[PDB]
Every structure is written in structure tokens, then in C-alpha cells.
Enzyme design. Structure first.
Site, PDB file in Angstrom:
ATOM      1  N   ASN A 140      28.954  38.837  24.056  1.00  0.00           N
ATOM      2  CA  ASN A 140      30.066  39.157  23.175  1.00  0.00           C
ATOM      3  C   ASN A 140      30.017  40.634  22.834  1.00  0.00           C
ATOM      4  OD1 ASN A 140      31.472  36.474  22.409  1.00  0.00           O
ATOM      5  ND2 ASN A 140      29.306  36.042  22.029  1.00  0.00           N
ATOM      6  N   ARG A 145      28.737  49.528  23.020  1.00  0.00           N
ATOM      7  CA  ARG A 145      27.890  48.964  21.990  1.00  0.00           C
ATOM      8  C   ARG A 145      26.557  48.496  22.571  1.00  0.00           C
ATOM      9  NH1 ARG A 145      30.032  44.233  19.630  1.00  0.00           N
ATOM     10  NH2 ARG A 145      28.607  44.557  17.865  1.00  0.00           N
ATOM     11  N   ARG A 195      21.659  38.770  18.306  1.00  0.00           N
ATOM     12  CA  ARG A 195      20.950  38.981  19.544  1.00  0.00           C
ATOM     13  C   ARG A 195      19.496  39.271  19.215  1.00  0.00           C
ATOM     14  NH1 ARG A 195      25.537  41.405  19.031  1.00  0.00           N
ATOM     15  NH2 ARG A 195      27.308  40.579  20.221  1.00  0.00           N
ATOM     16  N   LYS A 240      25.392  33.100  32.989  1.00  0.00           N
ATOM     17  CA  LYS A 240      25.955  34.424  33.270  1.00  0.00           C
ATOM     18  C   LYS A 240      24.844  35.486  33.254  1.00  0.00           C
ATOM     19  CE  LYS A 240      27.309  38.388  31.576  1.00  0.00           C
ATOM     20  NZ  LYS A 240      28.488  39.061  30.988  1.00  0.00           N
ATOM     21  N   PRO A 257      27.525  36.511  38.947  1.00  0.00           N
ATOM     22  CA  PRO A 257      27.712  36.220  37.524  1.00  0.00           C
ATOM     23  C   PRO A 257      29.174  35.863  37.282  1.00  0.00           C
ATOM     24  CG  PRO A 257      26.765  38.478  37.834  1.00  0.00           C
ATOM     25  CD  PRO A 257      27.205  37.936  39.178  1.00  0.00           C
ATOM     26  N   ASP A 259      31.613  35.589  34.377  1.00  0.00           N
ATOM     27  CA  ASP A 259      31.995  35.887  32.999  1.00  0.00           C
ATOM     28  C   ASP A 259      33.519  35.883  32.929  1.00  0.00           C
ATOM     29  OD1 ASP A 259      32.498  38.224  34.502  1.00  0.00           O
ATOM     30  OD2 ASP A 259      32.656  39.338  32.620  1.00  0.00           O
TER      31      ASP A 259
HETATM   32  C1  LIG Z   1      29.613  44.110  29.975  1.00  0.00           C
HETATM   33  C2  LIG Z   1      28.762  44.803  30.948  1.00  0.00           C
HETATM   34  C3  LIG Z   1      27.693  43.870  31.460  1.00  0.00           C
HETATM   35  C4  LIG Z   1      28.109  43.129  32.666  1.00  0.00           C
HETATM   36  N1  LIG Z   1      28.643  41.923  32.589  1.00  0.00           N
HETATM   37  C5  LIG Z   1      28.880  41.565  33.871  1.00  0.00           C
HETATM   38  N2  LIG Z   1      29.521  40.460  34.334  1.00  0.00           N
HETATM   39  C6  LIG Z   1      29.770  40.344  35.667  1.00  0.00           C
HETATM   40  N3  LIG Z   1      30.344  39.259  36.076  1.00  0.00           N
HETATM   41  N4  LIG Z   1      29.405  41.278  36.566  1.00  0.00           N
HETATM   42  C7  LIG Z   1      28.686  42.304  36.199  1.00  0.00           C
HETATM   43  S1  LIG Z   1      28.193  43.259  37.473  1.00  0.00           S
HETATM   44  C8  LIG Z   1      28.447  42.527  34.764  1.00  0.00           C
HETATM   45  N5  LIG Z   1      27.956  43.524  33.955  1.00  0.00           N
END
Ligand SMILES: CCCc1nc2[nH]c(N)nc(=S)c2[nH]1
Ligand code: NI
Length: 316
Positions: A140, A145, A195, A240, A257, A259
Site C-alpha cells: 500500500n 514513500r 509495516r 506479490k 508478481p 499486483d
Molecule cells: C511499487 C514499486 C514496487 C514494485 N511493485 C511491483 N509490482 C510488479 N508487479 N512488478 C514490479 S517489477 C514491482 N515493483
């Protein structure tokens, strides 16, 4: 007292690595959500910490230029051979990104279009500890940040390396430091919110339940699925985050990942909907299915292909 170098300033102290812009764009990699320890302190010049040393990195069209600050009242020198190999391996430069892009392009016209604009997105090979705790901070949250939290966490818990202009650089802390009785309280006072509990509890869990950092190294040679599942036993680590660590630090290039970004990419750009699943929106089952879809389409480096799109979805 000591200042961040530029190529102009101190060219006696830079060494170079033959590297096409097309294999690596510093500006698309170093601050697009993989590592959070790099900043463009002066234009085209990226400074950050790599393994208890500070570096500045800049590049031409065919050259990656780099310099090291040792700190420990050392006599300034150009980077050594072994330090250059460390940087080589950090950018996994043995892997051809041109051939991956063609291989992925051959099956994905959308990837072809996007990759025109976004060349040189490759995966860093990160330290497991650092990557783990960075991604626990990622829930989140946004890049900026996260960046701030990781920086404060390192100033408060990790050793001082050097100062350059008004920026003080610390190494990533060891697990014992993040695991002691006041660490959650401190971390809350550093802005980490909830966190902070996961950080302290995960440090404590790896130490006592898993035998310390050598466990992360075993996950690095275990199969993807084993690594994934073991990571998901840690506090604050789900699918994730585990995927990110797998992809970014445990040499699992097939880790995808899933997300909010790639869920959205898949629907919008590929027209994918969860097929077997009757539920229409996100779920743990549909998220796993979407990961399998991307591996199926892109192959054993799906995670790297995912990064290219991730990096492009960030820039409008
Ligand atoms: C908010 C930055 C952190 C971050 N979240 C991610 N989620 C996905 N799906 N890919 C990559 S590479 C990634 N990096
Ligand atoms: Ni639809």
C-alpha cells in the site's frame, strides 16, 4: 566536504564497462520499483549503495561509466577488476536483453509496441535481505514513500558508509539489528506504520525459525515454487511480495508478481479475464492463474518481461 562525482569532474576516477544503452537504461531501471537505493543526485548521474560501498553510475550510448567511494579513509582510486565484476553481475549483463525482447516480441504484439519506447529494462540481481525488507515496506505504498522508509531504516539501523554533499549513506542492516526489542517502536517513529511490525517479526522469524541469512541463500538455489512458498510464511510477505523477491533476488526469472498494475495491464492490454474462475475480480486463485498465463506466453523469463511493462505503466 566530499562531493558527488560527475564524469566531467573526476574522469581519472571513473572506469567503464562496454554496455549498449539498448541493453540497459539506467534511468528506466534504477528507480522504477526494483531497488530503492538509487538517486539521480546530478543529471544523468545515479548514486546509491551496493554491498557496503557507494557508487555513481552514468552512461553513454555504448558505455556504462562508474565510480566507487570506499569511504574508510581510503585513498581514492578507479574501481578495481573485482568491483567491476560485482557491478557486472548486479546488472546480470551476461544476459542478452536484445534476444529476450525479440523472443518475447515474437509472441506478443503489444509487447512489441511498448518495447519500442522502453528499451534497456533489465532485472537487477539484488541482495536477498535488502530486497525482502524493501518489499515488506512496499505494501500500500508508492516508490517515493518506500524510498524514504528504506533510507531512514538504513540510517537508523545500518552502519554509516560515507557522506557526499548533504547525503549520508548507510549499508543495509543485518537481521539481528532489525530484530531487537525496540526495533518495531523505532520503525513506527520512522514512518513505517504497520509495516514496522512485519519488519521486526520477519527479522526475528528468519533468525530463530530459519537459521539466519543462509536460509535466503538456500532459497536462491531452491526451485521457484519452493522459494515462493517459504517466503510466504514470513510476516507481511504474500504472493506479490514473494514474487518480487523471487524475481529480483533469488534468481527466479519466471516469477511474475501480480499486483494492481499487472492485473490492470492484463485486462486492459491483453483482454485477459480469469477463465476457470467465476469470480470476476482479483483473488489469490485468479492472481496465480494470471501468473501462469504470462509464463505460458513469455516463457521462463516472464518476470523480466513483466518488468518491462511494469516500468512502462509507471510513465503515463
Ligand atoms: C511499487 C514499486 C514496487 C514494485 N511493485 C511491483 N509490482 C510488479 N508487479 N512488478 C514490479 S517489477 C514491482 N515493483
Ligand atoms: Ni473485460
Amino acid at each position: 566536504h566530499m562531493r558527488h562525482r560527475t564524469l566531467s569532474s573526476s574522469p581519472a576516477l571513473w572506469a567503464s564497462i562496454p554496455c549498449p544503452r539498448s541493453e540497459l537504461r539506467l534511468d528506466l531501471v534504477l528507480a522504477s520499483g526494483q531497488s530503492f537505493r538509487w538517486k539521480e543526485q546530478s543529471p544523468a548521474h545515479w548514486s546509491g549503495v551496493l554491498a557496503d560501498q557507494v557508487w555513481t553510475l552514468t552512461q553513454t550510448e555504448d558505455q556504462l561509466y562508474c565510480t566507487v567511494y570506499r569511504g574508510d579513509d581510503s585513498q581514492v582510486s578507479r574501481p578495481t577488476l573485482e568491483e567491476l565484476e560485482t557491478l557486472h553481475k548486479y546488472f546480470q549483463l551476461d544476459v542478452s536483453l536484445a534476444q529476450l525482447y525479440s523472443h518475447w516480441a515474437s509472441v506478443d504484439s503489444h509487447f512489441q509496441r511498448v518495447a519500442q519506447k522502453f528499451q534497456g529494462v533489465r532485472l537487477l540481481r539484488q541482495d536477498p535481505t535488502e530486497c525482502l525488507f524493501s518489499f515488506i515496506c512496499s505494501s500500500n505504498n508508492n516508490i517515493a514513500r518506500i524510498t524514504g522508509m528504506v533510507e531512514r531504516l538504513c540510517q537508523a539501523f545500518g552502519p554509516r558508509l560515507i557522506q557526499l554533499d548533504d547525503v549520508t549513506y548507510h549499508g543495509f542492516p543485518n537481521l539481528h539489528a532489525l530484530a531487537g526489542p525496540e526495533a518495531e517502536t523505532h520503525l513506527r517513529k520512522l514512518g513505517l506504520g504497520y509495516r514496522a511490525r512485519y519488519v521486526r517479526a520477519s527479522a526475528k522469524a528468519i533468525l530463530e525459525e530459519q537459521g539466519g541469512p543462509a536460509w535466503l541463500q538456500q532459497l536462491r538455489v531452491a526451485p521457484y515454487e519452493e522459494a515462493h512458498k517459504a517466503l510466504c510464511t514470513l510476516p507481511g510477505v504474500g504472493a506479490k511480495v514473494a514474487d518480487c523477491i523471487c524475481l529480483m533476488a533469488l534468481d527466479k526469472p519466471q516469477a511474475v508478481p501480480v499486483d494492481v498494475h499487472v492485473w490492470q495491464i492484463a485486462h486492459r492490454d491483453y483482454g485477459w479475464h480469469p477463465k476457470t474462475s467465476q469470480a470476476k475480480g482479483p483473488s489469490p486463485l485468479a492472481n496465480k492463474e494470471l501468473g501462469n498465463f504470462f509464463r505460458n506466453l513469455w516463457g521462463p523469463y516472464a518476470g523480466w518481461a513483466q518488468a518491462v511493462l511494469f516500468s512502462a505503466d509507471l510513465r503515463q
